[PDB]
Amino acid sequence: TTTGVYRIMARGILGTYQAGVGVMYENVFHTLWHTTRGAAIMSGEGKLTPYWGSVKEDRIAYGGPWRFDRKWNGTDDVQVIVVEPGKAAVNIQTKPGVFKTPLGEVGAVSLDYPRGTSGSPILDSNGDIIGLYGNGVELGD
Amino acid sequence: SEFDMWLERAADITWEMDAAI
Ligand SMILES: [Cl-]
Secondary structure, X not given: OOOEEEEEEEEEOOEEEEEEEEEEEOOEEEEOHHXXXXXXXXXXXXXXXXXXEEOOOOEEEEOOOOOOOOOEOOOXXXXXXXXXXXXXXXXXXXXXXXXXXXXXXXEEOOOOOXXXXXXXXXXXXXXXXXXXXXXXXXXXX | OOOEEEEEEEEOXXXXXXXXX
């Protein structure tokens, strides 16, 4: 289906560049807010506009609500479908680092990639997306 | 001038066994 991982490409005065990455899942395109800042995005003579968004959470969904609801168990490795600018997609298996915040316990990917890689999905062993790279994951069973 | 944003498919959503190996 249209389900998959997509480069968010942009073109303007700065030529063509990769603004970020997002995921189409259950007819909703998910990415990070700072990537698009709520701008419209084309999908082949078909424009998508924000349905839901949070600046503070830095998350945004086009065409419907945020669909991902699974969390990291805080034990097992995860895989990031890394979509770097100017390189083919790759799966990278890694162990997130647990970090405590006033809002709750959080996991983050220790890997470092260029700017436009943000939004690359993080999967658990079941293939469920538990967060986007550059935004992290939540803890829970 | 023109500013546009669009989507370009890069991968399927999937776990890969080889990535573990
Ligand atoms: Cl992250």
